[PDB]
Amino acid sequence: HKCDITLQEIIKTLNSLTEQKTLCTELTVTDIFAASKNTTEKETFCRAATVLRQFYSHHEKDTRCLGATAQQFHRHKQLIRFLKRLDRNLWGLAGLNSCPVKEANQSTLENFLERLKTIMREKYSKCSS
Amino acid sequence: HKCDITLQEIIKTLNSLTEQKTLCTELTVTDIFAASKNTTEKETFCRAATVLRQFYSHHEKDTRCLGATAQQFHRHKQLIRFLKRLDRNLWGLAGLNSCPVKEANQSTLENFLERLKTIMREKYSKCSS
């Protein structure tokens, strides 16, 4: 769906995520953007979609993340709401469900998102520019 | 040359570069690691090799870079020595000379190098790990 508004949806959510830091946003994900190997737009998206289902699934209720304060619980709940909202959107654009995450280094989620954010602002320029 | 010591060569030079900041290391390069599209290890390397010949070639003698002080000229001269040393090494591993840099966003060189550094520490783990 190269140029659907789905991209803007992915984009407006990537900033709600990159704004709000939380306890867990320093946990790590397999840095799937550490290849050279190369994939195709569709699997980039499946691979990222995959990296994120893992994550939120493993940390929705992680003692290290839930928070103590009601500020903390709230940000956590938001973080997760948002990761599945991007998640939904990435698998929608993927339109493939096959995923062979292979890379090895890990990256904090915070950086993973920073990078999906760029790759995604770039798909966007290529759609108007 | 997937796993030749050429990788260690690329690696020991990527740190001499990421250590030393200079005036110019904030100039920009076409962020070739802003695709989804995907390429193959060989062209990743050609594309990066290409991005770097451009750069040093355009800034070896750039008034904004030469420096005023003898500390400044020295770092500049080093920066350039080093970019062609990585350059030589990337085109050697490439073993392709065809390059269609297409991406649009730009990234400071400093970040471009940060990222080549990772992709390269990862080729390395995959060669021993």
Q: Does B37 touch chain A (CB under 8 A)?
A: yes
* Closest-approach residue (CA) in chain B for A129: B104
Q: Which residues contact B38 (CB under 8 A, 6 or more apart)?
A: A37, A38, A39, A40, A41, A43, A44
User: What are the backbone angles phi and psi of residue A128, rounded to the nearest 5°?
Assistant: -135, -35
Q: Which residues contact A18 (CB under 8 A, 6 or more apart)?
A: A110, A113, A114, A117
Distance CA A106, CA A123 (A): 24
DSSP 8-state secondary structure symbol assigned to residue B108? E
- Give first-to-last CA distance, chain A, whole Å: 17
| Resolution of this structure in Å | 2.2
Residue spans per domain, chain A? 1-129
Decide: B31 and B112 in contact? Cβ < 8 Å.
Answer: yes
What is the number of other CB atoms lying within 10 angstroms of the CB of residue B34?
22
The alpha-helical segments, DSSP class H, found in B1-129 are 6-19, 41-59, 63-66, 70-94, 109-125
Contact at CB, A38 and B36, closer than 8 angstroms: no
Decide: A40 and B40 in contact? Cβ < 8 Å.
Answer: no
**Which of A36, A118, A129 should we substitute to test contact with B (largest number of B Cβ atoms within 10 Å)?**
A36
Which whole-number Å values give the CA distances from B67 to B22, B23, B24, B25, in the listed order?
9, 8, 10, 13
Method: X-ray
DSSP β-bridge partners for residue A108: A28
Distance CA A122, CA A114 (A): 13
DSSP β-bridge partners for residue A106: A30
Which residues precede chain breaks (C–N over 2.5 Å) in chain B? none
**Which of B36, B90, B105, B127 should we substitute to test contact with A (largest number of A Cβ atoms within 10 Å)?**
B36
Tokens representing A5 are: 């508004």
| A44 chain-B contacts, CB cut-off 8 A | 36, 38
Q: Which residues contact B88 (CB under 8 A, 6 or more apart)?
A: none
DSSP 8-state secondary structure symbol assigned to residue B28? E
DSSP chain A: -TTSTHHHHHHHHHHHHHH---TTTTSEEE-TT--SS---HHHHHHHHHHHHHHHHHHHTT-HHHH-SSHHHHHHHHHHHHHHHHHHHHHHHHH-----------EEEHHHHHHHHHHHHHHHHHTTT-
Kindly report the CATH number that applies to the domain delimited by A1-129: 1.20.1250.10
Contact at CB, A104 and B122, closer than 8 angstroms: yes
Q: Does A44 touch chain B (CB under 8 A)?
A: yes
Decide: B116 and B46 in contact? Cβ < 8 Å.
Answer: no
Q: Does B1 touch chain A (CB under 8 A)?
A: no
SS3 state of residue B94: helix
Find residues 89-108 of chain B whose CB sits inside 8 Å of chain A. Answer: 103-105
DSSP 8-state secondary structure symbol assigned to residue B8? H
Contact at CB, B33 and A33, closer than 8 angstroms: yes
